[PDB]
Design a protein around this ligand. Structure first.
Ligand SMILES: [Zn+2]
Ligand SMILES: [Zn+2]
Ligand SMILES: [Zn+2]
Length: 52
C-alpha cells in the first residue's frame, strides 16, 4: 500500500460542502490518496484508490 496521508478536513482546515477534501488544503487529495484513516467530515475526495 502507498503512504497514506491523513487529514482533519472539517474538524480543522476548511469545512465545506463538496470541496472539503477536494481542495488543495487536503494532503490526501494533493498527494493522490484516499481518506483512509482520516478525521475528515464531509469528505468528498475524488481520489478513490485505484484498485482494479
Ligand atoms: Zn481532507
Ligand atoms: Zn484525508
Ligand atoms: Zn477526506
Amino acid at each position: 500500500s502507498p503512504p497514506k496521508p491523513k487529514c482533519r478536513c472539517g474538524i480543522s482546515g476548511s469545512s465545506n460542502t463538496l470541496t472539503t477534501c477536494r481542495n488543495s488544503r487536503c494532503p490526501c487529495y494533493k498527494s493522490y490518496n484516499s481518506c483512509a484513516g482520516c478525521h475528515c467530515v464531509g469528505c468528498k475526495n475524488p481520489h478513490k484508490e485505484d484498485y482494479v
